[PDB]
Design a binder for this molecule. Structure first.
Ligand SMILES: Cc1cc2nc3c(=O)[nH]c(=O)nc-3n(C[C@H](O)[C@H](O)[C@H](O)COP(=O)(O)OP(=O)(O)OC[C@H]3O[C@@H](n4cnc5c(N)ncnc54)[C@H](O)[C@@H]3O)c2cc1C
Ligand SMILES: Cc1cc2nc3c(=O)[nH]c(=O)nc-3n(C[C@H](O)[C@H](O)[C@H](O)COP(=O)(O)OP(=O)(O)OC[C@H]3O[C@@H](n4cnc5c(N)ncnc54)[C@H](O)[C@@H]3O)c2cc1C
Lengths: 300, 392
């Protein structure tokens, strides 16, 4: 009945929103709480350090919080959840702001990172996101999260989102105040020269486990600081994570551990790591390719 | 309280869904009946004679039944209506069918007309459109009573308070009676049969989607030549006419004229065909000339075959009115029934100003209200104008 999320980004909002509709439809769903160091949609803003905010989303903005508003496998009230959910869509956003015609008339431009933010923030308003402003300091098991506002929050499930800190590698974060490695790569390479089947799986990965591990890894390869989050775990809880995983915390190990609901599910408590559910469950889960199956996974 | 619509296509659905929304949502609206001679969305099917049904819609399909879900002016339960209305969108249609991931993933391909008919049809199922299957034959004041003839041979008279005309004419109607002048429908029939005379000096009149589709069919036949005859801020005026009145008649007239050319896809297939040439000017005169047909623009051209893909004859509807109602409109409109005169009469609710009963003529509304009303560019504003506007 209570699910904590590190970061208030697309995934956080994706999970929250789906929870908002489920319970509001007579169905059960976790109460959803995001802890967020900076702001809803923070990593899409200039002050987030990962981008200037000016470069454009590199996937179609329709691929949003509820996309693709469909399940190959789900149970119960599918028609009505989808419908409810489209209320929080990109198109729904444009139409509340009365700019939907402008969008269409301009040729559907891909939005700036900073407007994608406005979107996220808007979804937060729309579902009255239960939001804790603060920085997750440490995590431990049932989970208890130390948030520096310094205080603790107990929750039953836990989701980690974000690619980490734009400051920790210059660092990309430093790079936007003023030999380059790695989309993010795509952008900053940009501002330096001056100074159907594969795609289906990203949005629909329910045929994922019917092609070789060699094949999947290839889809993940060519797709283009992943373990940053380990730091948040005390030794005690990282230990407990080393166990379920069945060895030291690399990602041959972490990735393969990750179950159908995006949770490891070798522990006494659920830890959701969608950013590492590419190889196991579907290559879109790490990003914006299918936020709606992601939400579907952790709540249904 | 009751609104009769000639034809069940985008505009009928635009208005009837907005009706259905509003009635279910407390607010008042008329029961909306649509009389349709063929099928819901029939003019987007091959069987409607206007298209082979396989060509693609040239406007973004997001410009649908409720677009753009926003009024500068209309107030009332707006969020609840836009939210209700988006249920009937292209997007929703794709989502209810599971195909939305594929649509996005394929690059948002524009739908084939016949898929756009499936959309229209789906919306009809979804709003439980009150549909009457027959041809409107006669319209007449006294509200309106309209004669509808079923295929069963029966003929009944529906009555209504208000009436909207939709549709662009008849596909079987060339602009000139001559067997070498072909209505668009005869074209599809003959194209389909490969019975278009080999090595003809063919002409296609028209400059829009109807002409675009047919040029694209006709390049597939062994024609000798194929001559084509036609005469952001802008774009925005199609979706949002609110600032249309802040423009002169030569300004407003020159947006409506650019409204005519062709698809980027079709453009290529024509750009890269040595037989296809473009001819400028206006068809002042068509007359048979023995073996061929002679078309005047002056300049005279002869052709072994002419295809009328103008996309409609806009006063076609007048042929439905009886003398009484025609005169009655001639009086309201202030002179004889020319295009110009009838356009000049269109009010803000899209109806003829100063007429005893309500006659909604969206297709005539470009000049006076906005250039999107005739087409798929602002169906949601249209529905508003005919249902939610109050004074004048
Ligand atoms: C510039 C950029 C562009 C991208 N473009 C796309 C794209 O176009 N399409 C696509 O599919 N994917 C793309 N990606 C991949 C992308 O990272 C994921 O799609 C995206 O991160 C999903 O957001 P999220 O919810 O996982 O985390 P984010 O939205 O990045 O949110 C993480 C949040 O956590 C907060 N935070 C950080 N540390 C802490 C802490 N210790 N405690 C509490 N809060 C914290 C931050 O302020 C931030 O708000 C892009 C990535 C970047 C960096
Ligand atoms: C092939 C084609 C392509 C077009 N492409 C576009 C486009 O891509 N984008 C755009 O904005 N606009 C385009 N247009 C302009 C187009 O006509 C309008 O945009 C669109 O027609 C809206 O249709 P409607 O509701 O007015 O009527 P329609 O969709 O034509 O339907 C009218 C209905 O009337 C029925 N009918 C005819 N006579 C009678 C009668 N006596 N009684 C009862 N029913 C009758 C027909 O069966 C038909 O179903 C196109 C037009 C054509 C012909």
């Amino acid at each position: 009945e209570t699910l904590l999320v590190v970061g208030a980004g697309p995934k956080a909002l994706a999970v929250a929103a789906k929870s908002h509709v489920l319970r509001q439809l007579g169905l059960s769903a976790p109460r959803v709480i995001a802890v967020e160091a900076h702001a809803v949609g923070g990593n899409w803003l200039a002050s987030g350090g990962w981008t200037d905010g000016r470069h454009r989303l590199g996937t179609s903005p329709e691929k949003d919080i509820g996309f693709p508003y469909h399940s190959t496998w789900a149970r119960g009230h599918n028609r009505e959840i989808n419908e409810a959910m489209m209320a929080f869509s990109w198109t729904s956003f444009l139409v509340e702001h009365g700019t939907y015609a402008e969008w269409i008339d301009r040729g559907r431009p891909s939005p700036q990172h900073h407007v994608w933010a406005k979107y996220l923030q808007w979804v937060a308003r729309k579902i009255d996101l239960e939001l804790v402003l603060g920085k997750v300091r440490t995590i431990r098991q049932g989970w208890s999260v130390e948030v520096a506002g310094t205080t603790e929050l107990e929750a039953d499930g836990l989701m980690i989102t974000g690619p980490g800190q734009s400051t920790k590698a210059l660092s990309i974060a430093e790079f936007w105040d003023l030999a380059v490695i790695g989309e993010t790569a795509g952008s900053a390479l940009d501002e330096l020269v001056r100074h159907y089947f594969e795609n289906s799986l990203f949005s629909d990965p329910t045929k994922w486990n019917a092609l070789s591990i060699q094949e999947r890894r290839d889809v993940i390869r060519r797709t283009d600081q992943p373990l940053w989050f380990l730091d948040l775990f005390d030794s005690e809880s990282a230990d407990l994570l080393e166990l379920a995983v069945g060895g030291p915390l690399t990602q041959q190990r972490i990735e393969s551990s990750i179950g159908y609901d995006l949770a490891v599910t070798g522990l006494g408590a659920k830890l959701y790591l969608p950013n590492m559910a590419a190889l196991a469950q579907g290559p879109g889960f790490p990003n914006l390719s299918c936020l709606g199956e992601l939400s579907d996974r952790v709540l249904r």
